[PDB]
Amino acid sequence: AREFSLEKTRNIGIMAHIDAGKTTTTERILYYTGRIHTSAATTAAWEGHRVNIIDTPGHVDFTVEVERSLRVLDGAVTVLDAQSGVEPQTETVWRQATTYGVPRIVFVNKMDKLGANFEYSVSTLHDRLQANAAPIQLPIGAEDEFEAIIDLVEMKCFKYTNDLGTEIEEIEIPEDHLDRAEEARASLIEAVAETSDELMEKYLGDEEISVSELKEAIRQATTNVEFYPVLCGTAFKNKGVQLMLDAVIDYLPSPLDVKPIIGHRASNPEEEVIAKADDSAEFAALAFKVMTDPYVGKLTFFRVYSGTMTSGSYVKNSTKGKRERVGRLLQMHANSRQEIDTVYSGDIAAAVGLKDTGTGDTLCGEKNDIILESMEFPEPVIHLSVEPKSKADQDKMTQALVKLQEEDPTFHAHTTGQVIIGGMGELHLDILVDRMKKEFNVECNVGAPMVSYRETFKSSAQVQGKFSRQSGGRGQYGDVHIEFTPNETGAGFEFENAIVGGVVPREYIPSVEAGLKDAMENGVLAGYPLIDVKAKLYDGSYHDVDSSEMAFKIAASLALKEAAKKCDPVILEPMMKVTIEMPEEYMGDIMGDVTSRRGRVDGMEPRGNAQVVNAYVPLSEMFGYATSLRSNTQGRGTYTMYFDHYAEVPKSIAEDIIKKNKG
Ligand SMILES: [Cl-]
Ligand SMILES: [K+]
């Protein structure tokens, strides 16, 4: 039976600038929730509750990996430096968490350092973010005088007598602080009642609000992402850390308190599947980290959303379309490793030595096909060539690439030993290359990024392709007439067989189609794949011995070559959907920048004190976008970018592309 109920489970991340003390706060949480008074996830406990502490990345930019982490954790502790409150880095991350429906409590850390100011720090939540945040605590003293904390919910006071976290004394609220405490409690009830009609009716109706009534309302508002409790302390000198952990229990969600994860069936990507926490339901879990341990070998960390799985059983890796035997399962505690037999909905563990299961893969039952992570457009849009410095550097590169694919499912690599890497954007490529060079000690030269262009035809033509040769021992013969016509943008390749009366024998018709496919891949105008073209085979000739599958592949090739002279080919470029969220005062510079990159806007909508812009920008004009965005928003804006459609390149730009590719 499960040790801890669904209701008594807390999946949390810590969100903090390195300057706000993320690592000390993280060390203290691990100490207090451990047994004795770095892991992708630590299994821990507090007050009869399972607490799983999930590592969150330090990215200044929103990556596929940041998004994965928001989907694995359920709640977070946002840590601020008492001297400066919310900084730009803190703000971008906060806006991303709101989009993913993640409840937060705020911990104002460093209350003992020079310049500490609880009231100012709380005011930055209001001004920078328009967040409905209110103190549930008040500090007594600041800097070297920080000495006590008032719990405003219970109306009790806790005094600290040392820097170790022991011998805490409960005292009466000091006389000179009672008015200020009563005032803050009233402010706390008002901010919560803005989200609750029934509470507001009680408050205005001059009724008393019990402790249990107030906690319940705070929890409801918090787990609905309509309210943010604000707490205070100092992690390094152990004051307020135990009260912060009690607040994780009191106010942060169980796996049932947040929106369920959304996936689809492998057999039908348009059919939606909701995976809610339910031990009797079908199993579904998502892999989110892969570690290689010197003793146990490969560790794949996963979060279970629904159902249960037992060690020694077979599951489906639905992303690969392959079965996996789950041989052994580990939970990593602060001071020990623990082997377990079963993992339940809401739980996190690591599977030991999976053959073919990496980060971002879905596991489900053998009989089922739910997928929880994918991209609508999986293909790379930008590529880079990488040249190893030597044999030793070549060998290292081969190893690096295998390990990098386990960690990031969104890049592709093809390896003569020149390697071409394909990815989703300039930052993505830079992160991978950095990891190769620094972490796997590979010495290499890297080329300029190359956007993934395509070609298409703008007009139609009939052409003959005829192949007649005897080199060298006997003749090969193939003869086709084909009509080429442009297809709809996005509709792809379509081959039509209009041969009647066997003028081209049925056994060589698939060869005409396959020959056209292969030739189109090489492009006609600047070396990029030709797409969105229709081709109809309607006449030709043959001989009963001299014709061959091969002869007709070549005949079809010569026909495309003739058609490229007559069908007005053009270069197409990838157009990205660029979604920009920034404080509203930066509209002017954000929109001017979109215009300067040949982009356009289709809809912009307010969200809090922000605007959300739907823009379309050519990928070739997105180099340096994150830098300009950081500069135009004082570090406070964030964005995502995905492939959207192909568009024709302007005439003078295409001429540059052809001039350059001809050297
Ligand atoms: Cl405490
Ligand atoms: K767990």
CA distance 350 to 303: 9
Cα-based angle 483, 489, 495 (whole degrees, multiple of 5): 35
Is 177 annotated as ligand-binding? no
Distance 245 CA to ligand 1 centre (A): 8
Distance 40 CA to ligand 2 centre (A): 13
Query: Does residue 441 come out as left (phi exceeding 0), alpha (psi in the -120 to 50 range) or beta?
Result: left
Q: How far apart are the first and last CA of the chain?
A: 70
Q: For residue 168, which ligand has an atom nearest its CA?
A: 1
Q: For residue 164, which ligand has an atom nearest its CA?
A: 1
How many Cα neighbours within 13 Å face the side chain of 548? Answer: 12
| Cβ atoms 259, 305 nearer than 8 A | no
Residues facing 468 on adjacent strands: 477
| Cβ atoms 107, 135 nearer than 8 A | no
Residues facing 101 on adjacent strands: none
| Cβ atoms 344, 2 nearer than 8 A | yes
Instruction: Report the helix count and the strand count for the chain, using DSSP H and E.
Output: 15, 38
Packed helices 64-72 and 88-99: angle between N→C axes, nearest 10 degrees:
60
Within 8 A by CB and 6+ apart from 605, the residues are: 611, 612
H-helix or E-strand spanning residue 593: helix 587-596
Distance 402 CA to ligand 2 centre (A): 29
CA distance 478 to 555: 6
125-128, Cβ contacts within 8 angstroms, sequence gap of 24 or more: 125/85, 125/86, 125/228, 125/230, 128/85, 128/86, 128/91, 128/583, 128/636
| Cβ atoms 571, 649 nearer than 8 A | yes
Residue type, 494: E
Is 310 annotated as ligand-binding? no
Residues facing 365 on adjacent strands: 315
CA distance 303 to 270: 24
Within 8 A by CB and 6+ apart from 182, the residues are: none
Q: For residue 28, which ligand has an atom nearest its CA?
A: 1
Going along the chain from its start, the domains and CATH numbers come out as 1-259 (3.40.50.300), 260-378 (2.40.30.10), 379-453 (3.30.70.870), 454-573+645-663 (3.30.230.10), 574-644 (3.30.70.240)
Distance 334 CA to ligand 2 centre (A): 14
CA-based nearest residue to 135, from 153, 117, 113 = 153
Distance 165 CA to ligand 1 centre (A): 7
Please report the DSSP string for 378-440 in residue order. -S-SEEEEEEESSHHHHHHHHHHHHHHHHH-TT-EEE----EEEEESSHHHHHHHHHHHHHHS
Tokens of 636: 């406070």
Please report the DSSP string for 155-200 in residue order. TEEEE--SSSS-S-EEEPPPGGGHHHHHHHHHHHHHHHHTT-HHHH
CA distance 507 to 526: 34
Distance 298 CA to ligand 2 centre (A): 19
Residues facing 340 on adjacent strands: 329
Packed helices 509-521 and 549-564: angle between N→C axes, nearest 10 degrees:
50
Distance 349 CA to ligand 2 centre (A): 6
Within 8 A by CB and 6+ apart from 653, the residues are: none
CA distance 565 to 461: 10
Distance 108 CA to ligand 2 centre (A): 28
CA distance 359 to 498: 48
Please tell me whether residue 604 adopts helix, strand or coil conformation. strand
CA distance 192 to 315: 45
The residue to which tokens 């001017």 are assigned: 592
Distance 348 CA to ligand 2 centre (A): 4
CA-based nearest residue to 194, from 231, 220, 212 = 220
Distance 235 CA to ligand 1 centre (A): 10
Tokens of 463: 């052409």
CA distance 172 to 452: 69
- Cα–Cα distances in angstroms (integers) from residue 300 to residues 351, 398, 417, 535, in the given order: 5, 21, 30, 47
CA distance 165 to 167: 7
Give the pairing of strands 75-81 and 9-15: parallel
CA distance 260 to 105: 21
Query: Does residue 219 come out as left (phi exceeding 0), alpha (psi in the -120 to 50 range) or beta?
Result: alpha
Q: For residue 159, which ligand has an atom nearest its CA?
A: 1
Residues facing 618 on adjacent strands: 575
Distance 91 CA to ligand 1 centre (A): 27
CA distance 101 to 261: 11
Distance 367 CA to ligand 2 centre (A): 25
Q: For residue 157, which ligand has an atom nearest its CA?
A: 1
Is 20 annotated as ligand-binding? yes
Residues facing 422 on adjacent strands: 383, 412
CA distance 615 to 608: 20
CA distance 181 to 150: 8
Protein residues near ligand 1, an ion, with CB under 5 A: 240, 242-243
Please report the DSSP string for 233-255 in residue order. -BTTTTBSHHHHHHHHHHHS--T
Is 438 annotated as ligand-binding? no
Tokens of 624: 């340096």
CA distance 317 to 285: 10
Residue type, 190: E
Max Cα-Cα span within the chain: 110
Distance 279 CA to ligand 2 centre (A): 13
Is 132 annotated as ligand-binding? no
Query: Does residue 206 come out as left (phi exceeding 0), alpha (psi in the -120 to 50 range) or beta?
Result: left
Is 56 annotated as ligand-binding? yes
Distance 242 CA to ligand 1 centre (A): 4
CA distance 280 to 344: 10
CA distance 440 to 463: 53
CA-based nearest residue to 633, from 579, 578, 577, 590 = 590
Q: For residue 237, which ligand has an atom nearest its CA?
A: 1
- Cα–Cα distances in angstroms (integers) from residue 359 to residues 52, 304, 583, in the given order: 19, 14, 33
Q: For residue 165, which ligand has an atom nearest its CA?
A: 1
| Cβ atoms 430, 386 nearer than 8 A | no
Is 19 annotated as ligand-binding? yes
Distance 193 CA to ligand 1 centre (A): 27
CA-based nearest residue to 110, from 135, 149, 82 = 82
H-helix or E-strand spanning residue 477: strand 476-486
